[PDB]
Each structure stands twice: as structure tokens, then as C-alpha cells.
């Protein structure tokens, strides 16, 4: 899709392998913010969003949590607390065969900057000048949607770049997108390191009498500490207590 | 331009600081455990410039 009207695909309830994307040689850029690219097969997320669009080569640096410019302000905004990765690669053999326009448009003019993950499609005429035309086009009144001119082999840095950005949702309903990890057996009444689909800790697990409602997975004791957890394969209600310690 | 200018696309894990890693061992970037040399999903890590 164009820079504006960027695609938004929802991914959930799957086993996600991120080593296939990182090992890909085509990807020219694979910046990851808030997460380590190597430590991505060990995590668990609730929802993953993939946004695909094509931009100009010099314009890739604007796809970052705290950058500014035409794209960041008017086309695609990333929140400063971004937790995800941006994947971009050069595609001059598919988007610049002839003319390169291929309905690749962007937004030069807008009244104000965008909010994070906000889209803005409008045929309204922008008034960049003194005279309030209040009509369509004319002098000092322009159409915001300007097309990309992708002349075949117009020098590196102006060639089309296809960008796919992934956003990882966290702190929500039980995670549905998880890495390719083989679950092991359940060990109780022993000081063991447990890994309950994202929640990592060390302690001893015992049978609990807590009556979770059928929609609660976690449990917080006083001082906001996680003391109870639900097994994601048998729905068992397990009690977590710290291992013995002292001076 | 090759002039024996090669690099390493594939490795099991990231390097330690100031650590060298020269190996002709075949990397397995795929599902099938070939456990031999090359083949599908089994590649030579050293790729030339």
C-alpha cells in the first residue's frame, strides 16, 4: 500500500517463528525497539500487528519511535514507547519498472501532526498561503496527496523501499502469539525455575485452593506480587511461593 | 571484486567481544536436520562479497 492508507493486519493464536525473518538476507534494515531480536523466540505476546507500506529510500530513518519529518508528522506515527521491530528492504525491481508512481502517494500538507498509529485519508484541499480560497485547489491551495516519482534507477536513496513494521502488544488477556518452545513437564513441591508463557520466576509450586473465576489467569497478593498462576495446558491453579532464604 | 572478501551470514549465536570464529561447518537454517554437508535448508555460512 501507499505510505498513507497503510495496511494493518492482526495476527493472533499462532506459533510465531522470528528466526525466519532475521535470517532473511534481503532485509536491509531490521531495527528492533524495546526488544532484542535474538531474544524473540522466548517471549509471548497477546496481539501482533503488521503494517506494510512503501516509502522513499532517504525516508526510512523516519520510521522510529522519536523521529520527525514529513512521514512521522503526517503519514505514519510511531509512539515513543514503541515495542516492536521495523523491517525494510530495497525493492527497485518491483515498484520502479516504469514511471514508478504505481499509485505510491504520500501527504506533504496537513493541519497538524498525527497521533500514534493514526490514519488520515482525505481529499480535502489544503490552504498553504494567505488567501482563504475555501474551495478546491487554486493558488495557495493544494492537494495534499503527492505521488512518488520512482524513475527506473534514479540513484540509490530515491528508490522504493518496502517497509513492514511489527508491533508487539503486552499486558493484556492470556498471550496468543508465542515463540517455538517445547513445553516440559510440571514439577511441584520443589524450588524450580518456571516459565509460564512469558511470566518468568523462581519458586516452589504447590496445589492451591484459590477459586479463580473462569476468566482470571493470574493472581496478585498484597504489595502487588504474583503469587498464583494458571497452567496454560491443564488450566490448573498453581500457588507460587518464594524459596527458603535467610541470613 | 570478490578478491576472497567473504563474511558470515549464518551462525548459531552472537559473538563475544573481540572473538573470532572461523569454521567450514554447515549451518542448518530450516526444519530438516540434514546433519551432513549443504543440501536444502543447509547452507555454507561463508558468503563472498
Amino acid at each position, epitope marked *: 500500500a501507499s505510505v498513507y492508507a497503510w495496511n494493518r493486519k492482526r495476527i493472533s493464536n499462532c506459533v510465531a517463528d522470528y528466526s525466519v525473518l532475521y535470517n532473511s538476507a534481503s532485509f536491509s534494515t531490521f531495527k528492533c525497539y524495546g526488544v532484542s531480536p535474538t531474544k524473540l523466540n522466548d517471549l509471548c505476546f497477546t496481539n501482533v500487528y503488521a503494517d506494510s507500506f512503501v516509502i522513499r529510500g532517504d525516508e526510512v530513518r523516519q520510521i522510529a519511535p522519536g523521529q520527525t519529518g514529513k512521514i512521522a508528522d503526517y503519514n505514519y506515527k510511531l509512539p515513543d514507547d514503541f515495542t516492536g521491530c521495523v523491517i525494510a528492504w530495497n525493492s527497485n525491481n518491483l515498484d520502479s519498472k516504469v514511471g514508478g508512481n504505481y499509485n505510491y502517494l504520500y501527504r506533504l500538507f496537513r493541519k497538524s501532526n498525527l497521533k500514534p498509529f493514526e490514519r488520515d485519508i482525505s481529499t480535502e484541499i489544503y490552504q498553504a498561503g494567505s488567501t482563504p480560497c475555501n474551495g478546491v485547489e487554486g493558488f495557495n491551495c493544494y492537494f495534499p496527496l503527492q505521488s512518488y516519482g520512482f524513475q527506473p534507477t534514479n540513484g540509490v536513496g530515491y528508490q522504493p523501499y518496502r517497509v513492514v513494521v511489527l508491533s508487539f502488544e503486552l499486558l493484556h488477556a492470556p498471550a496468543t502469539v508465542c515463540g517455538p518452545k517445547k513445553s516440559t513437564n510440571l514439577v511441584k513441591n520443589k524450588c524450580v525455575n518456571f516459565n509460564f508463557n512469558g511470566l518468568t520466576g523462581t519458586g516452589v509450586l504447590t496445589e492451591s485452593n484459590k477459586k479463580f473465576l473462569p476468566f482470571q489467569q493470574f493472581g496478585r497478593d498484597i504489595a502487588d506480587t504474583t503469587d498464583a498462576v494458571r497452567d496454560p495446558q491443564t488450566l490448573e491453579i498453581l500457588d507460587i511461593t518464594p524459596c527458603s532464604f535467610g541470613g | 571484486g*570478490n578478491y576472497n572478501y567473504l563474511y558470515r551470514l549464518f551462525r548459531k549465536s552472537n559473538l563475544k567481544p573481540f572473538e573470532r570464529d572461523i569454521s567450514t561447518e554447515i549451518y542448518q537454517a530450516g526444519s530438516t536436520p540434514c546433519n551432513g554437508v549443504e543440501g536444502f535448508n543447509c547452507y555454507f555460512p561463508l558468503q563472498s562479497y
Partner: antibody, heavy 126, light 112 residues
Framework: QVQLVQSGAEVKKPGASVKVSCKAS????????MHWVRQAPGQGLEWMGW????????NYAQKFQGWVTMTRDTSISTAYMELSRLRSDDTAVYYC???????????????????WGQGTLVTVSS | SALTQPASVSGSPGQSITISCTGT?????????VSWYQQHPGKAPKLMIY???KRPSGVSNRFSGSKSGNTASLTISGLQAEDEADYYC????????????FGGGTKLTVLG
């Protein structure tokens, strides 16, 4: 774009050895596998082996072990095949063919034998 | 060795012609990397179907391919005068012996 040039037609006598060279152009020579195949006149196609331009790794067919050697000079981007102990039954046409990518890639497929060359007509007799 | 392919196939214009290619379990039953090539008389073979059906550039939508069991099929419908060429089947063989094999070939004679 992609184009491959073979050696000249080979004329030899039985009991000798021959070398077949494929010089490629228009693409990154060390980015794709190079395949060697043979075809008897009027018969079906047959496969010799492939060579990985990066280091020189060779794989040979079951029925062509011992008298097949795979080499290549990447400085001039040429792939060499060495055939030893030639016999009159091997009078055929040999092709150099391009395989899939030598590197793992998700935006690339697995188009085997995508591009072929003109071929070398080897003729051996008394 | 190779893969069993029908030796002779005759096709009248306007009908659908299917060419079979039977293999083994470790050849076609596991690796979906089969391909089909058209060899013009006196010209080097040109790639037609790189994998089961998916086609490269410059190939008409008429052509198609399929995989079932330990065999594959190449489908052509509405033959043209350019179809009077040899057709070949190939696949990749693994199981600790990475190599590839070809088929027995087939001669297609388009009428009309």
C-alpha cells in the same frame, strides 16, 4: 540480463580427459548454485552435479563418482568441470545451469535450473 | 535413478492433456520442489513450472501443475502449434543423499 557462455566444441579420442567451462554474466556469480547436466542425443536428461561458488563444495551423482571433478575460477567468474577416462558412450551435450540462491532468503523461491547455457558438443571417437 | 514418465503422449487441439510423473516417498512425497521444462527441438530447455504449479514470468496462465501422493501432473488445455516440444520432469532427492533426478521424458505431438 543473465547469460552463460560455455567452452568451444570438444573433439577428443577415447581414453583422454576433457574440461568444460561455464562463464556467467549479468548476475552475482556467487549468489546462486551452478549445476552441471548432460543429455544424450535423442535420449532423456541427466544430472551431473552442482558447485557452490563460495568455497568449492562439490556434490556428485551416484553413477558419476570418481571421474567427475568440480572447480571454478571466481576471479573471472568461470565454473569448471573435469571429466576423466572419456569413452565413446559419453558423446553428448553438456549444459551449465543456475540453481537456487546459495543464501537463505524468504523473498526468494526455489526455481531450479532457471537459466541454461548454449552447451558444449563433445564428440569422442577413433 | 530417475522417475517414471509416460514415453508418448498425443493431444488433439482444444482438449486438456495431463502428463504424469511418478516418484518415491523421499523424492516427491516430502519435498515439493518438482519442476517441468519444455525443450524445443534444437533449443536448450526453458523453465516452465519451477514448483508444483506456480509459474515464472513469460508463462501463460494456461499452464498448471499439481501434486498428489508420490506423483505430479502437468496440465495443458487448448494446445497450440508451439507445443510440439519435449517435456521433462525433475525433483530433488534427500535422505542423507542430497542430489536431484530427472524423468523419462515425453514427446508431445500437437495436431491441427
Amino acid at each position: 540480463q543473465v547469460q552463460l557462455v560455455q567452452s568451444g566444441a570438444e573433439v577428443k579420442k577415447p581414453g583422454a580427459s576433457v574440461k568444460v567451462s561455464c562463464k556467467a554474466s549479468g548476475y552475482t556469480f556467487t549468489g546462486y548454485y551452478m549445476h552441471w547436466v548432460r543429455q544424450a542425443p535423442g535420449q532423456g536428461l541427466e544430472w551431473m552435479g552442482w558447485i557452490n561458488p563460495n568455497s568449492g563444495g562439490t556434490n556428485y551423482a551416484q553413477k558419476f563418482q570418481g571421474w567427475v571433478t568440480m572447480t571454478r575460477d571466481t576471479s573471472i567468474s568461470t565454473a569448471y568441470m573435469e571429466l576423466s577416462r572419456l569413452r565413446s558412450d559419453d558423446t553428448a551435450v553438456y549444459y551449465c545451469a543456475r540453481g537456487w540462491a546459495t543464501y537463505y532468503d524468504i523473498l526468494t523461491g526455489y526455481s531450479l535450473f532457471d537459466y541454461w547455457g548454449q552447451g558444449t558438443l563433445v564428440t569422442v571417437s577413433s | 535413478s530417475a522417475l517414471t514418465q509416460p514415453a508418448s503422449v498425443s493431444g488433439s487441439p482444444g482438449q486438456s492433456i495431463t502428463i504424469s510423473c511418478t516418484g518415491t516417498s523421499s523424492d516427491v512425497g516430502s519435498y515439493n520442489l518438482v519442476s517441468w521444462y519444455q525443450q524445443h527441438p534444437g533449443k536448450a530447455p526453458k523453465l516452465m513450472i519451477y514448483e508444483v504449479s506456480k509459474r515464472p514470468s513469460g508463462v501463460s496462465n494456461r499452464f498448471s501443475g499439481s501434486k498428489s501422493g508420490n506423483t505430479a501432473s502437468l496440465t495443458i488445455s487448448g494446445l497450440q502449434a508451439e507445443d510440439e516440444a519435449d517435456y521433462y520432469c525433475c525433483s530433488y532427492a534427500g535422505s542423507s543423499t542430497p542430489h536431484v533426478v530427472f524423468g523419462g521424458g515425453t514427446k508431445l505431438t500437437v495436431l491441427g
